[model samples]
Target: SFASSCTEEENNHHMGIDVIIKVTKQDQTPTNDKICQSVTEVTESEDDGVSEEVVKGDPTTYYTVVGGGLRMNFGFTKCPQIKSISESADGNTVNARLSSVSPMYGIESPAITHEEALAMINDCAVSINIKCSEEEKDSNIKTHPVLGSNISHKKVRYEDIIGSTIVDIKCVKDLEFSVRIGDMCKEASELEVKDGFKYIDGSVSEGATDDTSLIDSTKLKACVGSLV
Candidate 1:
């Protein structure tokens, strides 16, 4: 790739523009690259002979996916922020955790029933977006507390700081892919499918009525497969 800013020897400073970037499936056309690119190209910033003092950057924190749960057939809710991620060697399995909430009282909540699980899933109809990236380096924010006052603070820049997932979620036309609650599945009637398989759900068998065999669901560890 050709970079227009500095001498080729100085290319190490080159970085992607801060913008939305995606890695997607491939296409055979001349622009056949699977990863589409849109970036704000900038090599360096000039001071512009102006000096101003203002605080930038927010408190240091990591994105946590607190609670996770199943949505209607093709819907989802409370998906957790990926703590860490790694790709598999070809067909190997990579374990993932679903989002859920703990009991507000001292006791654990009741296990979700098949009917209750399906009812909640039926009403939930929201799409989810998952983003995974390397933890970012610490930003420039200095915090210094006021004299004799720990509550109020001054700016202090920390040396460093920073911030995955499988829960199926996607949609195209009337087609959709989503998550399922394993614990809530009925023993006799279950949802199952082959990996890399896609199909529409309809008729008596795949309709609201439960089917004897579809997919084996797991509790806590749920699966994101296709539906609708």
Candidate 2:
């Protein structure tokens, strides 16, 4: 069964095998030129003592002034699009290919160069993809109950195992799995207390708050426990 194969030993070993794909920024191509089309003619309306001039068009579209000058009022959103994800032959590394839409300012006025736009897009994509990979790693770890359970074990042996197994824990799980697993175990402990104790609320409050405060007013004990 599932439980039969699940054990602390197997979990520890499995944790050692890093399944997180290292997200590297591959080629960033600046594809299409999003041209700004002037849709509505400039309309002037008088209300109160003020005359308001308005021109309506697609928000993504913008216009540029003549003789290599970008119009002050116009703006374009930075589009960082992840095109594809490809894995290496060894299956150890993964790359995210990114691309950005090069918005046209004018013939003379290039608001942002293609190279500059692509660079910014690639930078944004890399940061986001890395975070995505971390989330995937955590979800992968959570699939095994034993693996998540062992996270709260503060024993020297367990600590050593975790330390050695996780080459770069910060990158892999963002220390999120460790904290989440601990909280999950705490919930289980609360359920156990309900089954074992006579006065459930009293016992829980006493153990959770009063008892913890009694150990250290400065919360040194709780802090140390959390650090572990």
Candidate 3:
């Protein structure tokens, strides 16, 4: 029961195709889980080949290998290598560990908890390990995202296609977080929808930036959510 899968509605490839990694329960146990991958394909129609008038299906999107030790699936075919995945038991909890990959990224203390693993997911974030022990003296008191009791430690940041702005979000709480690019803003909401999915979508303009001379430019968007 150690397999993962992705679907159409659960994912979308507007600008282009992308990859998705999932880890979820496969049985009725505290330690049962699976890690899997899936991809999205987008088709488009263009208006005389201008400004990507419409996105035409790209053959490469469906088979883009995310990073080291991993690739994509083909008809009845399989990837030769995959990142290392391991699971360990800690009392009543099971921790998932992934390594040498993007999105799935790499981590120190195994992956997050099973409870944490089931939350919404996207290609922008990741989990990692940290030391929560206290310092000796002059330590102005601290806890680096406190990895116990909680289930995730991930920091996500990515620049837009034009590279004018960047958005970052770190999830280590009730998954509560937000990001702003110029005047655009995004955050998880309590509004539940289809299949109890609290889906959300937004964009950030290339507005007002010292990095680029273009005053008015295209925007960068983000879409994420799957929980109520």
Candidate 4:
């Protein structure tokens, strides 16, 4: 008996393989070895042992719905506009009303201009809205001199200082603005008084003192008023 062996490293379709060839011949036999040159490449899906990565990522996708506006918040976080605006169904209107007033017997007499008349109405509301006893209305309406007078509650406290009368009035939303109408009666004594610019003293460019001077000593006086 005669024997021979062949051992060599080789790569096959499976993986790394060791091929051992055994030869025994009564008369020396030739080695007949056949190895497939091409390898069988398998995809990841087909191969079980070869693990691959799988991801679910994001959701299938949803939706969003919307509606109306109940509250109109018209400001920023710094300062808000209105405290609140609401609807009420359980309230009733009132028929009774009240007013405030000031006596004007001596007040409106000096007022010649329409602007001056408006000023007088509000100048004397001190007695406005005064509470009067039931007897006062039947006999004397003097009890509530302020409100019960011939004036309405709209006019307010009006005062006259120097030659100019200051009328404090109530406008929309409790807003107040002074309507001053008059010319200078007093001579320019001080810088702030803005002489040559108050009461009904006419003419200035002439630079003549007491020329056609409409404001006499009597005109310089401030008139007093009483609630009629």
Candidate 5:
């Protein structure tokens, strides 16, 4: 249940190569129901790419982690490393916890019993941790159009990507991990697919991709999902 070597649909380079800082579930399955996880700017390998919001979602998409992005998928992979957990200027809204985040992001807190405000901040933290938390490798990172491939490249803008443009649907179930990711469920319906086997492509890597070098641009992304 740990990723040792995997390929990312987005980069295609983080595959079939890596040692284990630790092994975790790493499978990058391509399904229509899957949410957009982690994606890089047009020039992420350039290492000097400016911060951009490549992945996006409604305030209600289900979230899942796949192997193939830049982080190691330890069991504790991507814990919410909060810097300044706070609210909006009006003190009634959430500002930026993540200046950036992964593309395959989604969440579905139960609307039956929970109020939006009660779950917004906590859920947003989960979304952000899914990417920035590093230590182990994952095998579930899929090929996000924005993550591994470039549609417009030089012809695209950050706003155009994050402005609720390319959307499939939002989730409506209660907030639970397995069901939310389609692990043991029949289907996600309008959300990301998680048939459990979607990521068993036998093409994922479970090792770290970093050269172990350091860069000042190794900036962290913080996100805050909240209601008005």
Candidate 6:
């Protein structure tokens, strides 16, 4: 009746909740710990330096002639965020904390080098002005002209800035863990241990095609369980 027992076990294993419960019962191993460590390390490396580069770029407007041409058409694809806005004590200029502007991509009409594009974005970030009159300030209105467009000359309001100060630990962990599990599954299939569970589970029926499985069922279950 071991085959019948195996059949019953396989039926239970097929149920998502039962499989999850069984997988959760297993203890963690060194391999699982290493996978987690690597996942975290990899996620940390994805931090970008784009913001840093923008900060390093010049924050002032300058008129200069280079390569026998006057270069002063600095612009941005989108207006940078106003981190904070306050009118100067003299009420002559608006002092605003602006976010780094990203350079426009796919510029073909007027070809520019990557360095030139970045300079344009940085210049626009520092030079763009926000006009807030007393009436506008009273109504809590904030607006600026759209960048790189002259025909329309449309005025756009500041968008609500969304910050990502908190890291989504759960999401990052799950994403990295799933990627590692895929690698492990590929290795298991190559090692021909994908059907190792069939020997223990006694579910090797006629034409048992374990090679056809995308991943070793047992390993997949175990790897997924580690996520929780």
Give the Cα error of residue 69 in candidate 1, in Å.
24
Cα lDDT tens digits, model 4, 1-228, are 111111121210000000001111111212111111111111122223354347422121110000010100111111101111111111110011111111222211111233333333233111111111112111111211222112211122223211221211111011111111111111111110101112111221211122122211111111111121
Give one digit per residue, the lDDT tens place, for model 2 in 10-37.
1121110011112111123111111111
- For each candidate in the order shown, give its overall lDDT on alpha carbons: 0.20, 0.17, 0.19, 0.16, 0.18, 0.16
Q: TM-scores across all candidates?
A: 0.23, 0.16, 0.17, 0.12, 0.16, 0.15
- Name the Cα RMSD for model 6: 29.0
Q: Candidate 2 at residue 69, lDDT? A: 9
lDDT by residue (159-220, candidate 1, tens digit) is 11101122232311111122222221112123111011122232111112222122211211
Residue-level lDDT tens digits of model 6 in 1-228: 111111212111100000000011011211111110100000111225544442343233211111101011111222222111111111111111111111121111222333443333233221111111112111122244212100110111222211111112211111000000001001112111111111112222211122222222222100100111
Residue 60 C-alpha lDDT in model 2: 33
Candidate closest to the true structure, highest TM-score: 1
Q: Is candidate 1 or candidate 6 better by TM-score?
A: 1
- Candidate 3 Cα RMSD (Å): 21.6
Which ranges in model 4 have alpha carbons more than 4 Å from their true place?
1-92, 96-98, 102-113, 118-146, 151-228
Q: Candidate 5 lDDT, tens digit per residue, 20-55?
A: 111122223122211112322111222233634556
Per-residue lDDT, model 2, residue 206, is 11
TM-score (C-alpha) between model 2 and the true structure: 0.16
| TM-score, prediction 4 | 0.12
Between prediction 2 and prediction 6, the one with superior lDDT is: 2
User: What TM-score should be assigned to candidate 6?
Assistant: 0.15
Q: Looking at candidate 6, what is the lDDT of residue 86?
A: 14
lDDT of 3 by residue, 1-228 (tens): 111221122112111111112111122322211211212222222223454534443222112211111222211011111222222222222222221222212222222222222232222122112111112222121222111111111222332211111112221111111111110011112211010000123322221122221111111111111111
C-alpha lDDT of candidate 2 relative to the true structure: 0.17
Superposed Cα deviation of residue 99, candidate 5 (Å): 20
Using lDDT as the measure, name the better of candidate 1 and candidate 3.
1
Model 3 global lDDT (CA atoms, 0 to 1): 0.19
What candidate 6 gets wrong by more than 4 Å, as runs, is 1-82, 91-94, 100-228
